[PDB]
């Protein structure tokens, strides 16, 4: 039912294939809901670091799964400039995968 919008641009899928999506049975799906700009969407890929990723979210090298996403800016962004979105960039150090 999700094959109806063009702005899905993250069809690169590492653990399995998007053609093999509804092909084999899965045990326990793990979904994490958040918003990342497309400037560092290539840093989301396993085996890669960056800065926003280096400080808040981490991904395993054996990325069992893959992400679907469309344009957030169209969804939320006031005419005065969306300053409502807040982030954190100045922690002590990095973090291991699957902690917060």
């Amino acid at each position, epitope marked *: 039912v999700l094959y109806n919008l063009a702005p899905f641009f993250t069809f690169k899928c590492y653990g399995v294939s998007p053609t093999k999506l509804n092909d084999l049975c899965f045990t326990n799906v793990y979904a994490d809901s958040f918003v990342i700009r497309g400037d560092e969407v290539r840093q989301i890929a396993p085996g890669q670091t960056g800065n926003i990723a280096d400080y808040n979210y981490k991904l395993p090298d054996d990325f069992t799964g893959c992400v679907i996403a469309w344009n957030s800016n169209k969804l939320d962004s*006031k*005419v*005065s400039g969306n300053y409502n979105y807040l982030y954190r960039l100045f922690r002590k150090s990095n973090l291991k995968p699957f902690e917060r």
Partner: antibody
Amino acid sequence: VQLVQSGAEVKKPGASVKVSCKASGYTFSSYYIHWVRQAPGQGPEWMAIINPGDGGASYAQKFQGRVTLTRDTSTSTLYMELSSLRSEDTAVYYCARAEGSSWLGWFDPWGQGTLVTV
Amino acid sequence: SVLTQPPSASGTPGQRVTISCSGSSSNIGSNYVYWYQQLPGTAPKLLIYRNNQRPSGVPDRFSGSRSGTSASLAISGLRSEDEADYYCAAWDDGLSGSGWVFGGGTKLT
């Protein structure tokens, strides 16, 4: 439910101009205004957005940092200041009226425009 | 894009002429298309909403659609008062900048 402009004349080069337009009718804080300039012999270009209430602003890339905006609801005027006027900036200014509560919207009828020359 | 438009579009009374604004990807293909009518000596005015029906009220002589990266509009019944020019408005979403890009100019007799 109508919009009117102000008057303008020839200004000296290397100066700043100020445009104000008045509106009447619907709620001032429940609508959005585009700021456009039309040059003779060429198509119009949109630069600035109006956010009434908090008076928020956003401009284009080629016209940012030289442009000053002031918005208020009690006076219901839009003080639209352009700086560093040159001979290429001879265009008719218009304050539009969007669909409301979104930049993505449809255009209401405009006013009469303000003409400045250098 | 830059909304390329033909410089003129001549015609005769009783004849229908199709005039189009041609763009590119992420401006006409995904974003909506606008058509606005400017009369000489007066304020800028609107011609059409989204290309399905009349904006507020007009006979069905004015109609148009879109295809690929272009938006076409057919005008029939040329009159003396019909002499004006037209503009195309669409969402740009270009690289490092998203200003409302318009078209060039057209001539109707």
